[PDB]
Design a protein around this ligand. Sequence first.
Ligand SMILES: NC(=O)C1=CN([C@@H]2O[C@H](COP(=O)(O)OP(=O)(O)OC[C@H]3O[C@@H](n4cnc5c(N)ncnc54)[C@H](OP(=O)(O)O)[C@@H]3O)[C@@H](O)[C@H]2O)C=CC1
Ligand SMILES: NC(=O)C1=CN([C@@H]2O[C@H](COP(=O)(O)OP(=O)(O)OC[C@H]3O[C@@H](n4cnc5c(N)ncnc54)[C@H](OP(=O)(O)O)[C@@H]3O)[C@@H](O)[C@H]2O)C=CC1
Ligand SMILES: [Mn+2]
Ligand SMILES: [Mn+2]
Lengths: 399, 405
Amino acid sequence: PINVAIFGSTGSIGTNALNIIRECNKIENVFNVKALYVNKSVNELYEQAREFLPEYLCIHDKSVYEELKELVKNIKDYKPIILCGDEGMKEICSSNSIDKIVIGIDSFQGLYSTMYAIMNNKIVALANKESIVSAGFFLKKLLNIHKNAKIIPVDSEHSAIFQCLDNNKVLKTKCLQDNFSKINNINKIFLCSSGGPFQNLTMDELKNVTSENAKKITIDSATMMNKGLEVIETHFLFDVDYNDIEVIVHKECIIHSCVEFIDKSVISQMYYPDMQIPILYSLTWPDRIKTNLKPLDLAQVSTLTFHKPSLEHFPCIKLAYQAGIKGNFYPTVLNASNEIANNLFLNNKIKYFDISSIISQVLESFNSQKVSENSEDLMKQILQIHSWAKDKATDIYNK
Amino acid sequence: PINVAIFGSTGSIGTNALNIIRECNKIENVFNVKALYVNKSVNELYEQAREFLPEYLCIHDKSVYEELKELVKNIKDYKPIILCGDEGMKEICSSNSIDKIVIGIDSFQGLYSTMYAIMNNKIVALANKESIVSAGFFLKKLLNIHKNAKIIPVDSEHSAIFQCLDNNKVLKTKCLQDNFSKINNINKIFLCSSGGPFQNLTMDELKNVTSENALKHPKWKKITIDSATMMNKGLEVIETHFLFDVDYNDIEVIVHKECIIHSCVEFIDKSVISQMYYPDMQIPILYSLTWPDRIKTNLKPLDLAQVSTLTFHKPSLEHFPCIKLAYQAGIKGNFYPTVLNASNEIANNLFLNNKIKYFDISSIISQVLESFNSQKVSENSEDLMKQILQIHSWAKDKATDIYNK
Ligand SMILES: NC(=O)C1=CN([C@@H]2O[C@H](COP(=O)(O)OP(=O)(O)OC[C@H]3O[C@@H](n4cnc5c(N)ncnc54)[C@H](OP(=O)(O)O)[C@@H]3O)[C@@H](O)[C@H]2O)C=CC1
Ligand SMILES: NC(=O)C1=CN([C@@H]2O[C@H](COP(=O)(O)OP(=O)(O)OC[C@H]3O[C@@H](n4cnc5c(N)ncnc54)[C@H](OP(=O)(O)O)[C@@H]3O)[C@@H](O)[C@H]2O)C=CC1
Ligand SMILES: [Mn+2]
Ligand SMILES: [Mn+2]
């Protein structure tokens, strides 16, 4: 059996992961769910524990900890190891009987978890964006030291790229390693985007749009900042130059991304918009297994369309390329300032273009810092810059 | 270096192969063209020999040998081995300085050459349709005996399927092996088709169409009609079945008029992988020679935003019965696909010169198939070739008879 831990099991990624594991396990017993970990959602964790009966349970908040140990007594024939906090997260990461860890934790605990999974030589099915956006350079260092550790991407677009690769080549290297694109003969990447709800809008129309027309995630789809962050993630994951990453708007969301190889042949991965396939592939790689999913009916789909995004209309994309090319903690600053700008737009306090304007001014003010060479100092360093960047964005608004 | 022979070097496949080879060599000297083989195109062969300077030259038609020999004399410091006919073909196949052979010969000499390449443990970059359509079963047997021989498909759709596969799995097996599709986790194949010039016509227009309508179409003589009826795609279904050990149950023809997605593979998890490029035979040929690797080219990059729209529809088996007939013929096996192809050759020509109706094409083919009696399969290459030509000739005659009917 493949022994899997699910970090952030009650969220969107965690829930889809459990959905697809359940489905596959009905066909043949392929997965053992060995561990589940959440922040505060004790009752939802409880119901998952009842179905999946994992050897380990962990909850980040100590207040609901004992509130979890006695709930579990209601489950018959079930005597799990119940753990709490960072210390419990680390105990799960250390377990010899766990092979793969799905990281579906939002924010910086996602990054912290990713670091300890790698340090324990695990396969990490990564969904968390902060991990690579903020510590791409340091994850590369950890992966260099921890030879058997791997990051396998779970986001639909990144999984698509990963699936288009030849595993004969992938097995010679791994994600986030220097020379990855050379070993895999990659020339460029087409990063597909739904385009969000603003694609048809004019500049003058955009000048006056409000949040009602388009919570956090939806606004990032509207501005296409989400795609900008994915560009940065692509660069790290696959060692592809920024100049060789092209964002493409494919509104039907059937083609999930494409890889052009050095001979100019293009390979792409297709399915209905569903997060189950990418998650399953992260857990089965380098193999595939049977599912019961509805087969793609291309004739039924009928029409697939592609256009270039206008950078004037979506300058958040421009800023993400700028921040990636600049490197250092500029992507951390990009993400933090976006968080503030996002919220201000949601509360009708700024206009659409003020979002990119604020982000642009925070980036302009940042200076490159020397990178911390250990996990704990880096976490502090990243949270410091994140906070600074959030503070600066707020300052610019108030001024 | 990759040491290559080009069989049928003066035809479309052969000249595409030399073109991509030349272009790739400019970037990095990767290929050595060791042998060139044609039927009778002596001037064109001489022109190629001047540039590529292969160790071997072969002409099938022994009668133009002196003409070739005298032309070759013009090339300073060049003394190739100049050979003739089957003896020459077999000699090239057995040469140890040739690792890969592009087979771009049309009709049955393509099959004969394919057998001998396999018998000599070569990598065969195969474009010729007759090979698999007429001797798929037998090629399978040869590939089991000659362990280091491989077929790698060169036609655009078959190459696309092949490129969609995970080479970590492909390396565990090879094309035409039993269990190829199980080892590669293949669930279903989307075999893409341009759709032919008749794709948009109603049932009523199809009862009425004539060959001029097909020939008039801007996007596309024999080849054009086979595209119109979709019999070309029917043959490619039979090829697909053998190349990838995919059961007929699991091959779906889909019409994609833009010709950008070249085919797709649905895997057992339902994830779908497709290969995409401009219609250009250079990529499929190159891949057959560089597999399992890829090398740099200077080909025009695919501009997806410029292409803008990609479309798909299901072809109606009522509108294109030739597809239905190809499946039945493949399912039956034996020499039925030889019969399908041969009877089609006549019915095609009949429709071309306005002698029969569109729907008569399939009617004739179906009838020759019904008439055919399963034959005992020859156990060696020579007897089998004789057998195949005999059955081919029979089926052509039978088709002429049902025309008269
Ligand atoms: N949703 C999607 O389809 C995709 C999401 N992403 C990325 O994946 C990450 C998470 O996505 P998503 O699942 O949507 O987010 P959700 O908010 O839906 O889920 C977050 C999960 O993480 C848990 N969590 C939060 N903090 C902690 C912590 N301190 N310790 C342990 N667990 C914690 C939550 O637990 P609790 O229930 O207790 O709050 C919850 O289970 C994000 O970084 C996002 O950008 C990327 C690609 C696709
Ligand atoms: N053209 C294409 O885009 C594709 C073609 N194919 C397949 O490839 C095969 C041929 O392709 P294509 O290049 O188009 O055909 P062509 O007519 O363009 O080329 C045929 C070549 O074969 C040579 N030839 C014919 N008979 C013999 C023989 N007895 N011995 C040695 N050489 C011979 C010809 O030489 P000479 O010049 O002297 O007559 C010529 O070089 C066909 O079976 C077809 O199904 C498959 C996919 C795509
Ligand atoms: Mn995404
Ligand atoms: Mn074809």
